[PDB]
Write a protein that binds this ligand. Structure first.
Ligand SMILES: OC[C@H]1O[C@H](O[C@H]2O[C@H](CO)[C@@H](O)[C@H](O)[C@H]2O)[C@H](O)[C@@H](O)[C@@H]1O
Ligand SMILES: [Zn+2]
Ligand SMILES: [Zn+2]
Ligand SMILES: [Zn+2]
Ligand SMILES: [Zn+2]
Lengths: 123, 122, 123, 127
């Protein structure tokens, strides 16, 4: 079971993706919590040259607000796809820029769980 | 001569980058105008795997607000560097996702000018 | 016009892409000439995180061979599409890593022409 | 430990990085094995827009030779760094384009070991 704040991240990212026109280019929303309690959101920008995932848009949005360290992040796909784990590129960026962060993923029983980013890039 | 709305983008991006701690990871801010007159901002996220430029963070921010078409964009560097012309990657993404967009760049005299994205990427 | 080496690069890139199975992931080939008298090829690797274009594969292939300075490059699309201009990300990488390079693109008449890389990223 | 064929990948990538000038742009070599036993190499191309890691250059090099499925890959760093585990971006591209592939990494004792790509991305991103 997630913390109350972590649950609100899922709610916020879900509301964000549900709110925008269905799009092939803008198909995932993300929300992150800063250590001060603020929440930052974002949607991906698909492009073959590596347009940012929603998580990276969130990182730049948090940075624009001088948010500092982020503690948890989640991504939610459109059309009711629900929680999506961060992709490998986002794992690398998250580890490198916010090594203390957790990402919300679905556990082996399909239940949301916040996992330390290092555990998502094991040896 | 920049329009009032375009000038506001420079003000906003400048305020954004000047408001955050000096960082090697977060070093450029961008601001874009949507067709309905809203303004969206963002800061870059440097990473060797292709962390997004500030422009791309702006595009995802606008998309999160269902902004639709963006009509003009600018990027401002930290440490009082002023207007930075979008890199080739950004030019391609901008052309592909907002073909009607203009980017604010410095003209030959160092003064702001808004140019069609196609002019930056023939 | 068009020099012998420029026409040869087109032939090499064309032969490369036409020699592989039709694929949505591997759909463009590139060839580049080095100042030390070698030609390097590559095919793109499509991925949403920014899998490299054919030109970037060529740059890494030249680098693996200690090729130094690339003087001309071209990309050819699969299914007989012919010359493709380098995308914006490739233009940036080429400018930064091989500023002396020319890229073969189509002119206003649709005929091959070698242009300085800076011409493809005007101010 | 490693199979004879897997070992040759380390040899080939090590040779490659030790055969180029020391560079901040070109700093890692990689080599992969196809099902037919062919080896394909590559070196990274550093760029802030996401210049490819050595592994991705290997993928495009294999693709140019109609190699088909790759079974194992390794990356070897310059400055005599030895084996480098594929970064998160490379893990995703490798999993997506060659889901059966193994990556050679260092074990707890610093010795080479071949691990399935899926093991390097637990709780995987899959739409
Ligand atoms: O019947 C068509 C395909 O169905 C499955 O794949 C789809 O559904 C998956 C589970 O939701 C998605 O992950 C995937 O993206 C879809 O393509 C099946 O696994 C495929 O083999 C079928 O072609
Ligand atoms: Zn991602
Ligand atoms: Zn850029
Ligand atoms: Zn390209
Ligand atoms: Zn990598």
């Amino acid at each position: 079971p997630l913390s109350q704040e972590e649950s609100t991240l899922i709610e916020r990212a879900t509301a964000t993706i549900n709110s925008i026109p269905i799009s092939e280019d803008y198909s995932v929303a993300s929300a992150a919590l800063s250590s001060d309690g603020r929440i930052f959101t974002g949607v991906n920008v698909y492009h073959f040259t590596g347009g940012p995932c929603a998580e990276l848009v969130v990182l730049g949005t948090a940075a624009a607000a001088a948010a500092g360290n982020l503690t948890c992040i989640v991504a939610i796909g459109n059309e009711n796809r629900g929680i999506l784990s961060p992709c490998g590129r986002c794992r690398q960026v998250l580890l490198d820029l916010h090594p203390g962060i957790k990402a919300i993923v679905k556990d082996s029983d399909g239940q949301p769980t916040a996992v330390g980013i290092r555990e998502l890039l094991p040896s």
